[PDB]
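Inputs:
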Amino acid sequence: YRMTLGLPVQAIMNCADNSGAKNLYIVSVFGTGARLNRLPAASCGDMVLATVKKGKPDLRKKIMPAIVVRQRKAWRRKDGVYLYFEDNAGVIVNPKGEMKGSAITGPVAKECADLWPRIASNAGTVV
Amino acid sequence: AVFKNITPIPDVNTFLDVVLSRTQRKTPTVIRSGFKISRIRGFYGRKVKFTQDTITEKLDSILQEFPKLNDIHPFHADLLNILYDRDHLKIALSQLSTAKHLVENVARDYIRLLKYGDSLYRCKQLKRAALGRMATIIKRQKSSLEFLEQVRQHLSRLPAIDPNTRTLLVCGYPNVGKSSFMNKVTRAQVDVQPYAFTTKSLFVGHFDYKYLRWQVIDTPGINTIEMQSITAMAHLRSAVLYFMDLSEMCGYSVAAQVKLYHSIKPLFANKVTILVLNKIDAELLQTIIDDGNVKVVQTSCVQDIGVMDVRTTACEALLAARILARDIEAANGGAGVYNVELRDKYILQDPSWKYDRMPELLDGKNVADFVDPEIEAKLLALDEEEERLER
Amino acid sequence: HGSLGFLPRKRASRQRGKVKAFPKDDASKPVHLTAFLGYKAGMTHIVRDLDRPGSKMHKREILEAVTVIETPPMVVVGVVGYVETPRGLRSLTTVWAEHLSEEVKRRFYKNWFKSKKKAFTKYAKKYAESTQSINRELERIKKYCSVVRVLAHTQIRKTPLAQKKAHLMEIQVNGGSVADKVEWAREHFEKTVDIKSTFEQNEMIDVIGVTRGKGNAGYMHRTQLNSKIYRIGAGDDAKNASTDFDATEKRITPMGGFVRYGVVENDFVMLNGATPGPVKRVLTLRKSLLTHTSRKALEPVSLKWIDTASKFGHGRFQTPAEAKQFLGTLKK
Amino acid sequence: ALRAQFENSNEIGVFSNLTNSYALVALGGSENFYSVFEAELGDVVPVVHTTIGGTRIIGRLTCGNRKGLLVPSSTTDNELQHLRNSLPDPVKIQRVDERLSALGNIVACNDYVALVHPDIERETEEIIADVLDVEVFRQTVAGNVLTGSYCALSNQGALVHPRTSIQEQDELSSLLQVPLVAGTINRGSDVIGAGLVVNDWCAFAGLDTTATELAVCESIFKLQD
Amino acid sequence: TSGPRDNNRNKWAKKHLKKGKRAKNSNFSKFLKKK
Amino acid sequence: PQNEYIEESIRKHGRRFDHEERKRKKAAREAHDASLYAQKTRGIKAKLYQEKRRKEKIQMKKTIKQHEERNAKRMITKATFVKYERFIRPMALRQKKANVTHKELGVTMQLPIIGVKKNPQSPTYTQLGVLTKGTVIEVNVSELGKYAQITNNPELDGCVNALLLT
Amino acid sequence: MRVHTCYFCSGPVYPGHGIMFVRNDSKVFRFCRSKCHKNFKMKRNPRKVAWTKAYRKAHGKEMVYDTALAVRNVPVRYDRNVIATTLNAMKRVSQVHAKRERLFYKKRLA
Amino acid sequence: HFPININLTENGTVVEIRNFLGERITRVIKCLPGVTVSISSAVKDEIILEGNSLENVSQSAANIKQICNVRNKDIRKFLDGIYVSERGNIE
RNA sequence: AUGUGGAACGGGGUAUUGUAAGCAGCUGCUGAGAUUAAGCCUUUGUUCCCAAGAUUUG
RNA sequence: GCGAAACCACAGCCUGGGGGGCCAGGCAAAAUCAGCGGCAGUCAAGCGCGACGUUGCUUUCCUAUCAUACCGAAGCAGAAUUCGGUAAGCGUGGGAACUGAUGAAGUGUCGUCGCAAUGGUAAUUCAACUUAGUACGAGAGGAACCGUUGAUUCAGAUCAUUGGUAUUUGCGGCGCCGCGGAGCUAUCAUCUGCCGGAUAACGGCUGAACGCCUCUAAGCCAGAAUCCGUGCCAGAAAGCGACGA
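Outputs:
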C-alpha cells in the first residue's frame, strides 16, 4: 500500500485544516526505516510530526501529529492513474489521531482517506 | 502498590553474580600487557565505571519501583503500615539509597584512585579492590532485600482500591451469611469457612447497580484482619453493611454485635449504615436502631433471600447520599481466504444472466454508457431509421 | 557486491537458457512434460479483477505489468535414455526419429548452405531398413532406464526471425511407468506436441534465460522463479487478445510491430513480471519444483482488457479500426 | 441496539451505510460485520456487502433513505450495476456530480425531511429532492456544513451535536420536525453521524459507545420499544 | 516470522500441502495428459 | 499469581493432572544430573559452579562434623598524606583518613592521620609523607596520639588499612 | 472502466498511460498525452492548438453533429437480450458515423 | 472450557486432535507401528491405547503428551491438558 | 556457393512535431507538411547481387 | 614509422614451523591481454600455619548476545517484565598473486546434446485482519496456533506505464526556443526471492549400573533465526558420455 516517497523532512507544508495554522515546518516521520542516500519521507496517508511555522502563536513552536492531504509529488496510485495536486498541504491531528481542525479545506487523497477515518468525516470535498 | 508492576527482589549475591557477569559480558574482558598505561587504566577503569553504573542501574530500578508510602491513600497507607511494618520498610529504603550513595562515593574514590594507576598488578589489585569492597557493601545489605520481596509479594497480592467510585463496605460478624450475598453480588467471590478470620483479606470485586458501578469492598469480621478492616473503613467513600445475626447463626450474640456496632459507631459516622438482620430464616437491637441511619433489613441467610432488595435499597441510599454470513464464511474457506459471491445477491430477472459476466466496454466505448432499458426497442427503431435514411 | 551466491561475475556459455534441475515426479502420475521454448516479444500491461480475499483491493480492478512470449508448436524428434551410475547420470542411447527439417539440420552445422547438407542421411537409411535395430535400442531403454528425456527443436519458421537454425532442447517426460514413457514417446515421434496440452493457465512457471548484455555486467544466466501464466493464446484465433469484457475482435500484436521484435502470429503465453534477456532472446519454461500453496496460484484468473497501443512512440489507440472513427477521414 | 466495531474501530458509521429499505455494507472487511447486520436486519431489509468506488467509506460518502440512495460522481458503474442488482427496483439508484463527493458526511436525510449543507449545489439539492423526496434544508449543523458528520438522523428521532446551542437545537429540531438529541456517540467522540447508526426498526452503536450515550440514543430514537 | 531452515514454517506447510494445492495439481496434470 | 488468591482458588480449580509425578522423577534425576553438570561444564562458569560446590562440600562437612557432635617527569605517583617539593602529589592521591584497626581491641575504625612518624622507603618520602606499607605514622588516639604501622599496602589497595603499633 | 477524455488533446484516455490531475476547485483534468499534459501546463487554449480537436471543432473543420440511430447517472436492472441489442447497436451507429462524416468531409473539402 | 477434539483414523493410527485450548492448529498424532489407540468409552476424556510393543506404545503416548504440550503460559492457572494415568498389560 | 535468399530504393503501418509551399477572399485546400532506423515494423512493388578465393585437420 | 632509460646475485604460488631458498603439507600444465578486594581477630581441612567458614569500616573475523529464533526459571491470571541457556545466521561488545577474456593441445577431426567431481549462496525484520474483546482477568486490560494481506532493507532481473540526455546535429518556431523519437535512466518505474533431513539447549520414552529409581549407561522421540544436503551460480579450459558425417 506504499505511495511515492519524495517529501523529505524539514519542509514547509500548508496547514490546510480549520485549526487556523498556515505553515508548518516538518519535524519527523513515523515508522520510517533507516535509509541512506534517501531521506525519510512521507506521502498523503502517513502520520508525521511538524512544528507550525505560520498561524496561531499557541500552535506555533508546538509540535503535533499531522497527515499529508494534498500531494505535490506524483503519488502513483494503485489504480495506475498518476495524480499531481496543487501543492503539499496537510492537517494537524492529535497523538491519538484526532484532527485539530473541525473542518477540512483543499484536497485529500483517497489512499489517505481509508487510513484515517477521524479526518475523513472532517472533509466533504474528498478529491 | 496497587499498580505496582515492580520487578522481583533477588538474592544479593545472586544480584551481585549477574552484575559481575554483566562486567564479564559487557566490558572488554581482555587486557594486553603491551597496551598503553592509560589504555590499561581505562580497561579496568571504564569496566568499573560501568560496574558502578550497573550497580546504580538495578538500585535505581529498585528505588523507582519503591513507591512513596506518604503518597498513598489514608486507607492504603495505614493498611500498608499494618501489613509489613512500613516504618521498618521505609528504614530499609532509607538504608538502600544512603548505602547506594555510599557505594557512589566509594566508586568515585576508586575512580580517582584509578586515575593515578601505576602498576599492572597494582591496578589488578585495585580492580579487585573496588569490585569486592562494593560487594562487601552488598554483603552488608543482606536482610534488606529479604523484606522487599515479601512486600513485593504482598503488594502484588494487594489489589487496587476503588474508594473514589461508588463502593460498599461490608463489615460486621465474621461470615454471617452476608459474604454469601456479597459472593452472589460481584464477579469475584471470597471463600469462607466456619473458622475465624476466614475473610482476612479485602476482596476487590467490580459490580454495577442501577447504571452505577457498586464496588463490594470486603472487610474482616471483628487482631490483624479486623485492624486492616478498620484502616480501610477509616478513609472510604462507601456505606456500611453491618450484618447482625438475628438467630445467632454466625456464632456471635446480637447484643455483642450491636455493642461492637456502637463501638464502631465513630468509624461508621458520616455514612448511611445498613442494619442487615442476617440469618432471619435460621432490646439491644432497639438501642442500635436509635441511630436512625442504619438500614434495618431482615436477611434470611439460611434461606438465601433478600440480598437483591437490600442491594436495591442500599444502592439507592448510596444514590441518596451521592447460518450467519460469517458462519457461511467459517465453512466455505475460513477468514481471509473465502470470497463472497454477489451474483446470487442480485435482483435481476434472468438468473442465468446474473451469474454471467457483463461487458463493461466495447469498441472503444463504454458499453454501459450507451445502455438503456428501452435500447432494444430503440435499436429496432435505429435499424428502421438507417434503412429509411438509406432509402 | 554482496550476493556472493551469484558471484563470480563471468558471462554465460550457452546463449540458450539451460535447465539444470528437473521436478520430482511419480509413476502414479500420468505422463506429462516439464520444459518448453519461447521468445521474448516484449513487456506490456493489462487490467484484471482481483478475486483475492484478505487483500486491500479484494474484488477491485488493478493494473498488472506483464510479458507476452512468442511460443510456436514444438517439434519432438526423438529420445535419450539415462542409466543411474555411482558416477552420476550417464546417457545410454540416443534414438532420433526418421525425418528432420532443414531448420534442425541447420543446428548440427555451422555452414548448412555451404556444406553438403548430409546430416542424418545414413541414420535415416537404417531407420528404413530395420526398425528392429531401433527396437533393440528401445529394448535397452525400457530395460535399463531411470530418467527419460525427449528431444525437441523449435518451429522457428513460424517465428519472424532472421535466425534459421532451430533451438534444440530436452524435455524430461514425467509420470507413468518407464515403458509408458517410451510408449508415449514413440506414439508422438516426428509430430508437434503443442503448448496448450502442457499448462492449464492457472499454473505458475519458473522461466529461465540469459540476461541482457550491457554493451562484464549482464549476459549471465538466471532462473527467475514464480511467474504466473494468464493466457496461452492461440495464434490461429483472432480472439486471443480480445477478452470476454472487450468482445470486439483484436490482435495481441501492437500497431507498428513490436519494439525490437515486430509481429506475432502464433501461440503465446501471457506471463507477468519480466524475465532475463532482451527482446527476442530464446526463453525457456519449466514446471515448479515444490507444489507451492500461495493463493496467488490457487486463485482463478479471468482477464478484463489488454493494451495494444503503439509502443513505438507513445500511442493512444487500441486498434487501427477504432482509430478511424475516433479520427476524421484522412486526406488519403 | 448493537455495540460492536467495524473490524478496525468503533466508528462503524463511516465504513458502511444503511437506508430504511436496504443496508449498504462495505467490502474488504470480515464477514462477521456483515453477519452482524444480517442477524440484525437481514431478515427485514437487504444488506449488501459492496465497496463504494473501491473504498471503505460507504457510510460517509453516500446518502440514502427509504426512497433511494444517491452516491458520488466517481462511483464505479460496475459497482453501480452491482448496486442496481443488489438494490431493488423500488430502491432508486442515481449518481450525483458535485465538487463535494461526501454525501453521507455533509448531508443528513430522514423519512420526511433532510438536512443539507449550506454550500451544496442547487442541482445536487434538486436531484436529492427528486430521489429521496424529503424536505431538504441547506444549512450548517452547529455552524458546520458537514451535517452528516456533526449530526445523525433517523425516523423516530434525531441526534445533534453537543456543542450546538439549545436554542439552535430547538430550531433545528423544529426544522427537522422530530426530536433531536444534542449529544455525542462513542462515549463523547466528535463523530455523531458516523458514531451511531439508526434505522426505523433498528439501530447500531460502536464498541466504544457509552452505556448512558446508547441509552440516550435509544430514548431519542424511541428504540426502547 | 521464520527462517530458511525453520521447521515451524515447514511443519505446518507439509500439512497445508496435503490439502489445497496438491489435489488441484493432480487435477491440473490429468487434463494436461489428455490428448 | 501465587498463594494469596491463587492457591486456594487452585484448590477449588484443581492442579495439574501430573503435578506430583513430574517433580519426583525430576527429583530422582537430579542425583545423576550433577555429575554431567560437573563434567561437561568448562570455563570460568564451571569454576564458579565449582566455587559453590567446594563451598557446599565444605558446608556439608562442617554440618557432618556438627551432626556427629550433635549425635554425641618529577612527580609523585604514590599516595601521600597532607625546592623541597620537586615531585607532584595529587589532591585525590593524598589521604587524610585511614581505617585504623586496634591491635588489642580489633576495632577497624576509620580515623584521621595525625602525621607521618617515619616512612621506611626513604627520608625524602618521610619528608613528603607518602602513604606506604609498614610506615610509622602519627594517629590521634584521643577518640580511641599514638603511632601505627601500615599492615596493608595502600598503593595497590587504595585504602590505608593500618594496624595500631600499640 | 469508463474511459475519460484528454483535457488538452481532446482524445480518449485509456488505462495505464497518461496522468489525471485535479485542481483546487475539485476539477479533475485528465491529459492523455505528455504534450497534452504540457499543453495543460502551458495553459494553451484547446481551440487555439491546431494539433487539438477543439480547434477543428471551433473552425468548421470538424463534423458538428450527427443524430443517427436516435441515440447516464441512473443505474438500471440488467437483461441479457437488452444488452445483446445494445451490443449490435454500436456496429450500425459506427457505420453511419463513417458514412456521414465522409460526406461531411466531402463538404468540408469542397 | 474448550474441549479438546480427538478423532481416531487409519484404525486409530492417525489421531486428529484439535481445539486444545480452542486452538485452530490441527494436531495430527501418528501412532507408532504396531499400536492401536482408541477413545475409551467407560470414562470420558480417556484414550485407551494398546499394543504388543510397549516401547513403541509408551513413546507414542509420550509423543501424544508432547503433541498438545502447553507453552507460553503459566502452568499453574492453565492446568487442564493431556495426561497419562493407566499404564499396564493387555492381560 | 540460388532462395516465401540477400543488398539498394520505392510503397504501407506506426509514431514525433505541428497544419506545408502557394492560391483566393483569419478562413477552405491544410489533423496538412516534414521526419521515422541509423540496436521501429511490414513488403506478391522496382533495380542489383550469388554460382568464392585462401587457410586449417583427418 | 622512429625509438630509449632506469634497473638487473639467481629469482618468482600459498599454510604451519625454524625467508623466496629449509622442513612437512595444500597442490601443479602451456601462450597472452585489460582492471588490480585488602587489614586485624576466632576458628580448624590437615601437614607453627591451615582451606571453605565467623567477628570488626572501607572489508572481515571473533561470542563474551545489543535485538530477532527457540526454550528454562520467577507472585509467570493475561499483557508487560526479570533471570538463565542454545544461538554470531541475519541485523543493530571487540580484531585487521586478487577478478576477468582469449587461447593451442591426449580424446581420428568437427558439431549438437546433456552429464557433475568440486567451488559460492539469501533473504531480512517489522504490523494488519479475523482467530478476540474472546481464554483469562473484580474490573481495567487482554492470549496464543492456523490462515490471510501488507510495509522496510537486501539481492536478482525488467525498461509498457512516469522521468532525464540530445550527434536522430530528427520536427517545428524565433546562434535561440518548443518537441524530441529510439536508446538510456530510475524504490523516479516495475516483477520475484524455496525446502528436506540431521542437531544445541530443553522436554521426553524405554531401561541397567545400584533387584528401586533414573530423559543415559547401550537404545529412542520431539526439538533453535542452528549446521548439512535440495534449489540457486559457474563448470576440471590434462574429468567424462550418447549421437550426427
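Remarks. The radius of gyration of chain E is 14 Å. The longest helix of chain E spans residues 21-33.
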